[PDB]
Amino acid sequence: MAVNVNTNVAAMTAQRYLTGATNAQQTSMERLSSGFKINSAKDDAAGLQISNRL
Amino acid sequence: MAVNVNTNVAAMTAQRYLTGATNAQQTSMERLSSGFKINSAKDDAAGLQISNRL
Structure with a gap:
C-alpha cells in the first residue's frame, strides 16, 4: 500500500490490537472484582466443572 | 497455593483446632464440675458399666 487517503x-491494526487489550482488561478486572478465576464456561470448561463439583 | 481473597x-485450620481445643476444655471443665472422670458412656463405656455395677 502506497500513499493514499x-x-x-x-x-x-491498531484498533484490532486495542480491542484485544480492552477485552484483556475487562476479563482481568472481572476476575479481580469477583475474586474468581472462572466466572463462566469460556474461561475453562473442565476447571468450571471440577470447581462446581468441589 | 497463591495469594487469593x-x-x-x-x-x-485455626477454626478447626480452636473447636477441638474448645471441646477438650468443655470436657475437662465438666469433669472438674462433676468430680467424675466418667459422666457419659462416650468416656469408657465399659468403665461406666463396671463402675455402675460397683
Missing part, C-alpha cells in the same frame, strides 16, 4: 491498514 | 485455608 481512502484506506488505512495501520488504523485497522 | 475468597478462601482462607489457614483460617479454616
